[PDB]
Amino acid sequence: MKTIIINGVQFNTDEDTTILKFARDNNIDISALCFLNNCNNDINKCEICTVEVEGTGLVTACDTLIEDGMIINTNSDAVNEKIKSRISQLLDIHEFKCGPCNRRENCEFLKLVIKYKARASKPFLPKDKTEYVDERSKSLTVDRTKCLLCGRCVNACGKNTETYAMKFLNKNGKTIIGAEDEKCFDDTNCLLCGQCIIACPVAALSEKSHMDRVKNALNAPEKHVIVAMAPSVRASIGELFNMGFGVDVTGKIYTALRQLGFDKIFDINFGADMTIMEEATELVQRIENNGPFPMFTSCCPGWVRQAENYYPELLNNLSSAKSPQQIFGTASKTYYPSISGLDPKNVFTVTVMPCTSKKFEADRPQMEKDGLRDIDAVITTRELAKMIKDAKIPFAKLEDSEADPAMGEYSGAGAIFGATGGVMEAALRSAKDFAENAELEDIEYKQVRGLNGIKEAEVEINNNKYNVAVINGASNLFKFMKSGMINEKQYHFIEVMACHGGCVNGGGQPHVNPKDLEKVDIKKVRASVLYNQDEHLSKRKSHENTALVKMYQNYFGKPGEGRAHEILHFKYKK
Numbered sequence: 001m002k003t004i005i006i007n008g009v010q011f012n013t014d015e016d017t018t019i020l021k022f023a024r025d026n027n028i029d030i031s032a033l034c035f036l037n038n039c040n041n042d043i044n045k046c047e048i049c050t051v052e053v054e055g056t057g058l059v060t061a062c063d064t065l066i067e068d069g070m071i072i073n074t075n076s077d078a079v080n081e082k083i084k085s086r087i088s089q090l091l092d093i094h095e096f097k098c099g100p101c102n103r104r105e106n107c108e109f110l111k112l113v114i115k116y117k118a119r120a121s122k123p124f125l126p127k128d129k130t131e132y133v134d135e136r137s138k139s140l141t142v143d144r145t146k147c148l149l150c151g152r153c154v155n156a157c158g159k160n161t162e163t164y165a166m167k168f169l170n171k172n173g174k175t176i177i178g179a180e181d182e183k184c185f186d187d188t189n190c191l192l193c194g195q196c197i198i199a200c201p202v203a204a205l206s207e208k209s210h211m212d213r214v215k216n217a218l219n220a221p222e223k224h225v226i227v228a229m230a231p232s233v234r235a236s237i238g239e240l241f242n243m244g245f246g247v248d249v250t251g252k253i254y255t256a257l258r259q260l261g262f263d264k265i266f267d268i269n270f271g272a273d274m275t276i277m278e279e280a281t282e283l284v285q286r287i288e289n290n291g292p293f294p295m296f297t298s299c300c301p302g303w304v305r306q307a308e309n310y311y312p313e314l315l316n317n318l319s320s321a322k323s324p325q326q327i328f329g330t331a332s333k334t335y336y337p338s339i340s341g342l343d344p345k346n347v348f349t350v351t352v353m354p355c356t357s358k359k360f361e362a363d364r365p366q367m368e369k370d371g372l373r374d375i376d377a378v379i380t381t382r383e384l385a386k387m388i389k390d391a392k393i394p395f396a397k398l399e400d401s402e403a404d405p406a407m408g409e410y411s412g413a414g415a416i417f418g419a420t421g422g423v424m425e426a427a428l429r430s431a432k433d434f435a436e437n438a439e440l441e442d443i444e445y446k447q448v449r450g451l452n453g454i455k456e457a458e459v460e461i462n463n464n465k466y467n468v469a470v471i472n473g474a475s476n477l478f479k480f481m482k483s484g485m486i487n488e489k490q491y492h493f494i495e496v497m498a499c500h501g502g503c504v505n506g507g508g509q510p511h512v513n514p515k516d517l518e519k520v521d522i523k524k525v526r527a528s529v530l531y532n533q534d535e536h537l538s539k540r541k542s543h544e545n546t547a548l549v550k551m552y553q554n555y556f557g558k559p560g561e562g563r564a565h566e567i568l569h570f571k572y573k574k
């Protein structure tokens with residue numbers, strides 16, 4: 001037993017944890033900034049977590065272990081003067097103009113400035129902001145006028161992906177963060193997954209904006225603007241409207257999008273059922289052809305970049321089905337004109353994604369046919385939240401509406417796509433029906449669900465056993481390969497997601513305060529919205545989606561053949 005006194009209050013504890021962890025568990029206030037993902041800024045620690053341990057002096061609570069007989073003061077004058085000084089030094093390298101800033105309503109640094117009444121010794125007012133901003137990437141942007149050099153992005157990149165594509169750099173004698181050799185991130189091994197943005201306390205890292213594309217399209221009278229959101233958006237945008245976590249706001253998003261002036265409200269979960277139509281068909285074909293095995297999913301652009309940059313020999317093993325976003329986009333410029341009379345040229349398709357890598361995918365040169373882009377604009381969950389707020393839409397009090405059904409209906413298989421294992425389960429529900437020409441009632445594949453780094457399961461399909469694997473996060477893909485786990489058995493189908501937890505924890509998602517992250521399992525609570533929708537949907541197999549069956553019946557023909565093979569596919573050769 002340990003006896004520790006914190007602010008004159010006696011505590012007896014069995015545990016071996018840090019002063020910060022103990023404080024956060026016992027309602028004692030200690031501020032923190034550089035500590036995230038169980039690591040602080042080792043080199044150049046922020047010291048916002050300073051507490052006083054009588055006898056030792058000022059220590060950083062985020063990495064100092066509680067000890068028997070320890071007497072801590074978290075709020076003495078010397079502690080507060082030290083913390084206020086460190087925030088003041090950060091204010092000296094921070095362009096403190098919150099009014100137009102994209103983190104204005106949820107900035108961790110603004111909260112610390114208010115809390116300690118910190119003031120810069122000299123206001124940082126850079127005249128030329130172009131020497132601090134890098135907007136060269138199709139997915140990420142850097143604004144160094146806001147960077148605290150707290151290292152949270154560098155640690156999050158290393159942990160979540162193990163690429164270390166985000167680095168500390170010495171530009172002209174001074175420390176900055178950026179890509180290798182200060183290149184555009186797109187030209188390096190970076191996966192453009194945006195986990196560095198998610199880890200940033202301030203507006204120093206952002207998504208590459210597609211808001212002007214959307215604004216101009218809605219204002220162009222001859223353009224018919226389609227919008228379709230990703231699985232994960234309905235499970236998370238409510239967080240930015242003070243609704244809490246795990247709230248299903250699908251119906252509110254549909255109404256908000258109509259109020260924003262979009263001409264047709266569709267859903268990328270329709271595109272998810274399309275990807276399963278093509279990919280489950282392709283899996284049954286590889287089974288019949290005795291290979292090539294394994295087949296990997298090709299729907300995560302972060303993973304496609306990881307395969308192109310680190311494992312190019314695996315590219316021919318990736319599924320030729322386009323991702324839900326791109327397969328939806330292809331059909332929006334071809335099928336959707338045939339059932340509406342719209343000129344293909346006038347259809348402008350916008351998606352809402354939990355992801356920054358999806359902007360890169362949408363802008364890949366060959367993701368078009370006959371000069372028409374599959375996808376014209378991709379805005380993140382955060383960008384749509386700002387669009388709703390700028391338009392003064394009372395999101396939390398909106399009435400529910402439904403999507404327009406032709407490319408808006410989705411099955412429960414499409415609904416779970418945003419969670420790790422979702423694509424795998426959805427694909428198996430169709431591939432087993434397809435391969436043994438039946439309609440099976442047992443459709444839940446709980447063995448591929450959950451937050452484990454690497455998951456596997458043996459599935460019997462048409463009286464033969466097959467091995468599937470789900471790789472949860474880019475660092476776990478590297479582990480799977482480098483450890484030789486890939487060679488313990490013959491894998492036949494492997495799902496790979498670059499973000500830990502799947503797309504519900506994507507790089508374009510709502511930022512979450514580090515205090516709420518320790519209290520709430522964000523990956524499980526966001527994913528639960530999607531599994532609950534599946535549980536309550538009438539159709540739970542992709543091939544039973546009524547709107548999709550008539551789309552293939554009337555326009556595409558059979559999946560994986562003819563017109564479907566001809567335009568709904570994409571294969572990478574580098």
Ligand code: HC1
Nearest residue numbers: 230232272299324325355418503
């Ligand atoms: O971003 C992201 Fe995702 O694996 C999510 O949510 S799940 Fe997807 O196949 C695609 O495209 C689908 O459907 S990638 C998204 O929209």
Ligand code: SF4
Nearest residue numbers: 097098101107202203
């Ligand atoms: S990053 Fe935070 S403190 Fe800095 S200008 Fe933006 S809102 Fe204000």
Ligand code: SF4
Nearest residue numbers: 157190191193194196
């Ligand atoms: S986008 Fe992903 S891979 Fe690139 S620097 Fe950020 S965390 Fe690292």
Ligand code: SF4
Nearest residue numbers: 147148150151153200
């Ligand atoms: S970009 Fe953000 S997370 Fe990275 S060092 Fe700067 S303030 Fe910290």
Ligand code: SF4
Nearest residue numbers: 300302355499503506
């Ligand atoms: S896991 Fe989803 S959010 Fe993350 S990079 Fe892949 S597609 Fe984007």
Ligand code: FES
Nearest residue numbers: 033034047049062
């Ligand atoms: S939060 Fe402890 S040194 Fe930064």
